[PDB]
Amino acid sequence: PLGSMTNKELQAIRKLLMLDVSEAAEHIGRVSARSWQYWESGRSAVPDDVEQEMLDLASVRIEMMSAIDKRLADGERPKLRFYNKLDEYLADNPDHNVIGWRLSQSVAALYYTEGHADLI
Template sequence: MTNLELQAYRRFLMLKVPEASEYIGKTDAKTWHDWEKGIEPVPEFVGNAMKALKKLRTDKVNIIINSINDRVGSNTIRYFMTFEEFKKVNPDLDVIQWRLHQSIATELYFRGLEKLC
């Protein structure tokens, strides 16, 4: 994965550098910035983890889209403004899962498939 691809993946997944560096890179924010700037090569495990998260996101979006026609009532998806709000509803999930959820909710909203609540 190139430095530009890493940054694109991180932004697509709505991750902040400190979150990505801690939870995915298992490193500090400076090192992550060095990867994104092309100063240091992106480790293979980081590229693989980002691709796996994108696949998980795509799979979840497809599941939701496929289920929309089977729903009764309005199509809404919860948008959590803070990680703390997300944890109240999903106590076993981490910040990466929160960001993934936010990214999915945003895409579905902008596709006109879900309303945010």
């Protein structure tokens, strides 16, 4: 199963998690931005650990969506926080980083586009 991530699959999961190339290269791949661009362009294969961390971030996203679903089924119309600046996010989440900020942006954007939540 692991190790079959294509370059375009990596680009797609990165874009869906709403990560910039530099952010993922610095915090996930722990490599230069050029190496991440090479991975997404097909020059070098996607490392196994990078792929596994992608799936892990996907699972974290699933947890967030599940909490919001719990709130929805209870009759709530959620007012979800969509942090424009990363510093505003880290002021409310000291043990997080830009990865969690982008994940929160993605979940809030999805639940607004679906029409179930308003963003503040």
